[PDB]
């Protein structure tokens, strides 16, 4: 059926203007509605009937629709605008959505604050040890985390998770978890995570010795 075409991503500096396009065969002949979806939240109607705007929507959000292209324009882009934006029409008794456009806010390099967490005593009782390394509020998203156990570099025994862009500062946060048996964990003393990132002059290491307080 009818196809709505959206670019997957749009990136803009704070205070700048984002333009999100929605392409469709003679889309100007249809009423175009726009939804904003922030991570883990329900979609929010931001623009209806091409250019009309719901009650709580800032004036900085504006829509236009003519020919083969509908456009959502966001002026003076703030960190609170980071979201996935979807265009929608009705065609041949069907609701058609665009594939969505992720709005990324282009901010400055920001070095991470690094923290290491030893396994809790409660978890150790269960026969497994999780060691957590936290990289708090950094930019860009790319960061190299290296786990070292008694100076031995670790591989294949850690997993990373990264948050979506922060709604207030445009940074990311990363967690790296090193998973070992209680046996392997108790066989070593020095636990360290080394962080390489473009916002650091040299790599930052956070460590602990199994046993201290």
């Amino acid at each position: 059926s009818y196809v709505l075409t959206q670019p997957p991503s749009v990136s803009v500096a704070p205070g700048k203007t984002a333009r999100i396009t929605c392409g469709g065969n003679n889309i100007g002949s249809k009423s175009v509605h726009w939804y904003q979806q922030k991570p883990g939240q329900a979609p929010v109607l931001v623009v209806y009937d091409d250019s009309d705007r719901p009650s709580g929507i800032p004036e900085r959000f504006s829509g236009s629709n003519s020919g083969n292209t509908a456009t959502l324009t966001i002026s003076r882009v703030e960190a609170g605008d980071e979201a996935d934006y979807y265009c929608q029409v009705w065609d041949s008794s069907s609701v058609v959505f665009g594939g969505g456009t992720k709005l990324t806010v282009l901010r400055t390099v920001a070095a991470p604050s690094v923290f290491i967490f030893p396994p809790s005593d409660e978890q150790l009782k269960s026969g497994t040890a999780s060691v957590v390394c936290l990289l708090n509020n950094f930019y860009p998203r790319e960061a190299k985390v290296q786990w070292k156990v008694d100076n031995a570099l670790q591989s294949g025994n850690s997993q990373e998770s990264v948050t979506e862009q922060d709604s207030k500062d445009s940074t990311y946060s990363l967690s790296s978890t090193l998973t070992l048996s209680k046996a392997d964990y108790e066989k070593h003393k020095v636990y360290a995570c080394e962080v390489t990132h473009q916002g650091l002059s040299s790599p930052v290491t956070k460590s602990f010795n199994r046993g201290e307080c």
Binding site: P43, S94, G99, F115, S120, S130, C213
Partner: protein, 212 residues
Amino acid sequence: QVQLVQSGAEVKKPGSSVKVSCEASGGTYVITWVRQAPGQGLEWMGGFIPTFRTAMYAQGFQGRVTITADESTSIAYMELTNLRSEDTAVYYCARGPLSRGYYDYWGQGTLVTVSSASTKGPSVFPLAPGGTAALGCLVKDYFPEPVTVSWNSGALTSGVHTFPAVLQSSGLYSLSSVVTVPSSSLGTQTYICNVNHKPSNTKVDKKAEPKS
């Protein structure tokens, strides 16, 4: 002041049925069902107008979808039969005005997980703590998604980072929720993570305090 309130996260065996409810809280229109597979886009499933007892369904569901309502209770329902693993999605109900084509009110979504596997509740462990300290809670070995994490029953929201779940080699999920706080507050303030796993009915509160 109308709020679309949906039923909770569920795990459903493949080859079964799911009925998702959508209640118009302080209200009563077109009722729409839209689904979202994790990391993907919005997909219309159908609409229903209780007044005109008329339903319109999306093609691509093999006629497995049924949308109903109860005007007496002001609750909308979506029934999806012959569930397959590809039906794992967040299910949204949305309300829009008659003949307008758009949806100005949306429910919070219901995560339906299609799985042969049994539900497992998480084990919650503390992440014990210059001027800024970090603490948190590790939420390990649960299935399916989702889990919710609040700090101090919702009083603490600033500096909170709840990470996306990672799928471990065990085939179970694990997530961490962290918070940065003033170092001066450790010894004064009490930090507790409130973890909820609706599919297993697990509710855990864990204190994240420095060692002895």
